[PDB]
Structure 1
Amino acid sequence: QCVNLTTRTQLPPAYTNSFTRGVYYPDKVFRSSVLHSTQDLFLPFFSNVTWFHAIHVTKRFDNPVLPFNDGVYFASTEKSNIIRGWIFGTTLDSKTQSLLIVNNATNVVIKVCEFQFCNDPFLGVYYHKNNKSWMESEFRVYSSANNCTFEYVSQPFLMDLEGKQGNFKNLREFVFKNIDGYFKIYSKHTPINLVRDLPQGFSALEPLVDLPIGINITRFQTLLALHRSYLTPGDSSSGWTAGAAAYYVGYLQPRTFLLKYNENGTITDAVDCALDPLS
């Protein structure tokens, strides 16, 4: 079960500005009504982030292999749960170990073993009209998984998978770092109402997890979900509809920031001490 998709149109890349996005709590200490200076791997203010989409009607299923230089800020604007996870590694071809974080329609799965990934890994939801339901059908990521070292599976649930038609209602932001064999993930979810072009504002990402994976990471790739129904004839490689989602990628560098904690202990503003002379 591993296909090379087609019926995809050509386009050059798109870029966008990050308006003071991508700040996280740098420790686990409580601070209140203070300005704290901190040096760490941050996403510089007003950075040039890359923009990827997937709207059909034009088809655009972007999931190329991107570098993972020193850490990654990843943002996703969606309404119908299209981005499902990522794969991280160096060669991604079963000669080396790789990490997979994925969200099935029922569990979250984290696995750090030897995968043989495809050229076009994805998941796939099928839509029936006779039966009133969107259901999870395909999981086409890897061929083999031999010498696993780390494994975690969350408690079972069930997502919605239902395709909406409004505007982007959910923003999800992640920061991925990889130091001393620890893969650290910071995360924040926010309710929005938007049409494109990742918004402005300020929200600080809170620590999500530290995985002790101990592997080398230099590249990564995003896992998207597909849509198949009675209107997608194809065979299995041309009969698919994309959906609607967008995601943005930027890279962290070592900077000094000045964070502001209000009286309740929340970071509400920051200054990038190397953006301008004013800062």
Structure 2
Amino acid sequence: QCVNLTTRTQLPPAYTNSFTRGVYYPDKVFRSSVLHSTQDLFLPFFSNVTWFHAIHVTKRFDNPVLPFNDGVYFASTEKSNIIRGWIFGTTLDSKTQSLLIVNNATNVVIKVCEFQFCNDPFLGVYYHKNNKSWMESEFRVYSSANNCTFEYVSQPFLMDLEGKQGNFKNLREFVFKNIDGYFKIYSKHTPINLVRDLPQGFSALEPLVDLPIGINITRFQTLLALHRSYLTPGDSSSGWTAGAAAYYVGYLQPRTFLLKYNENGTITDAVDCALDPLSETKCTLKSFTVEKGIYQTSNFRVQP
């Protein structure tokens, strides 16, 4: 069951700026054709996110245990679709409970158990020749499981394996939040093409799922799919078998956002209160078309 893989060399980190990307509906209540200002957890509007070239190809792999703090924004885009789930937990071992989410072409599974997750987890598949079809039986993500208190199953919400190549880059966006015993996940899915692999356009994340599970989480890591191949003894080779992959991670912060619910009850424009003085004006005036003038946006006092 247990499987390990390591690389002596470590891929360097990379920072990339993040535009409007990462706005989600703040409340379950519906609105339309109105400007609404609300304080909630959002990623700063122009924020330096961590871009990870997880898999590169003469090939290297990245299995980072990234930190978590009051929510996280995740984004990715690739034709191979190596990403297939996530793992969260204070320790990611049997000492305490931890959350797992896994996806397949037909269903999505979520569980909360004291999993003994491996240091280099991944899910393996291979082209079974006897059945002449792909098979998935290498669950190398974890070593053992116990006390399966909470479980849930849902549809493959965004596992669409589109058969398109070229100018059809598909972007998957996720937001994970932990609030008062609720693990709440919003998501968005859209095809866009740009010089960089994350567009500057503006779009909003819809609420995907909500799990009433109480747990303390400060660490998480991605789950990647490895397509094994029949490496005969003549080849005398073994190791990573997967295509190049990358993604972006960012940390949420408590900010006040002004959102413009459109006529169709959709938000297509928002401003962060603390981003710029002009955004402060837009927020205090509760509008976007600020007329020429001088405004008392706020007040400041030298702190002790």
Normalised to the residue count of structure 2, the TM-score between the two structures is: 0.82
Aligned to 1:252: 252
Q: CA offsets, 1:70-95, max 9 Å, x none? A: 10001111212211111111111101
Q: Give the whole-Å Cα distance in 1 for the aligned partners of 2:141 and 2:131.
A: 27
| 5+ residue gaps, structure 2 | 280-304
Change (3 A) 1:112 1:153: same
Kindly indicate whether the alpha-carbon contact (under 8 Å) linking 1:6 and 1:238 is maintained by their aligned counterparts in 2: no
Name the structure with the higher strand share.
Answer: 1
Change (3 A) 1:135 1:233: farther
Deviation, structure 1 residue 168: 6.3
> Comparing 93-102 with 104-113, which one deviates more in the overlay?
104-113
Identity score, percent: 100
Aligned to 2:134: 134
Aligned to 1:101: 101
SS at match of 1:142: coil
Deviation, structure 1 residue 31: 1.8
Kindly indicate whether the alpha-carbon contact (under 8 Å) linking 1:42 and 1:255 is maintained by their aligned counterparts in 2: yes
Deviation, structure 1 residue 249: 0.4
Matched, 1:240 2:243: no
Deviation, structure 1 residue 165: 6.1
Change (3 A) 1:146 1:101: same
Deviation, structure 1 residue 158: 12
Q: Give the whole-Å Cα distance in 2 for the aligned partners of 1:195 and 1:189.
A: 19
> Comparing 60-69 with 110-119, which one deviates more in the overlay?
60-69
Normalised to the residue count of structure 1, the TM-score between the two structures is: 0.89
SS at match of 2:61: coil
Matched, 1:118 2:118: yes
Kindly indicate whether the alpha-carbon contact (under 8 Å) linking 1:78 and 1:168 is maintained by their aligned counterparts in 2: no
Kindly indicate whether the alpha-carbon contact (under 8 Å) linking 2:57 and 2:243 is maintained by their aligned counterparts in 1: no
> Comparing 251-260 with 131-140, which one deviates more in the overlay?
131-140
Kindly indicate whether the alpha-carbon contact (under 8 Å) linking 2:50 and 2:250 is maintained by their aligned counterparts in 1: yes
Kindly indicate whether the alpha-carbon contact (under 8 Å) linking 2:176 and 2:183 is maintained by their aligned counterparts in 1: yes
Q: Give the whole-Å Cα distance in 2 for the aligned partners of 1:130 and 1:238.
A: 22
Kindly indicate whether the alpha-carbon contact (under 8 Å) linking 1:167 and 1:195 is maintained by their aligned counterparts in 2: no
SS at match of 2:140: strand
Aligned to 1:216: 216
Q: Give the whole-Å Cα distance in 1 for the aligned partners of 2:240 and 2:16.
A: 28
> Comparing 65-74 with 196-205, which one deviates more in the overlay?
196-205
Choose 1 or 2 for highest CA Rg. 2
> Comparing 19-28 with 100-109, which one deviates more in the overlay?
100-109
Change (3 A) 1:154 1:194: same
SS at match of 1:278: helix
Change (3 A) 1:163 1:124: farther
Kindly indicate whether the alpha-carbon contact (under 8 Å) linking 1:172 and 1:190 is maintained by their aligned counterparts in 2: yes
> Comparing 229-238 with 163-172, which one deviates more in the overlay?
229-238
Deviation, structure 1 residue 193: 3.3
Kindly indicate whether the alpha-carbon contact (under 8 Å) linking 1:170 and 1:189 is maintained by their aligned counterparts in 2: yes
> Cα RMSD between the aligned structures?
3.0
Q: Give the whole-Å Cα distance in 2 for the aligned partners of 1:3 and 1:226.
A: 12
Q: Give the whole-Å Cα distance in 1 for the aligned partners of 2:157 and 2:278.
A: 49
Deviation, structure 1 residue 125: 2.5
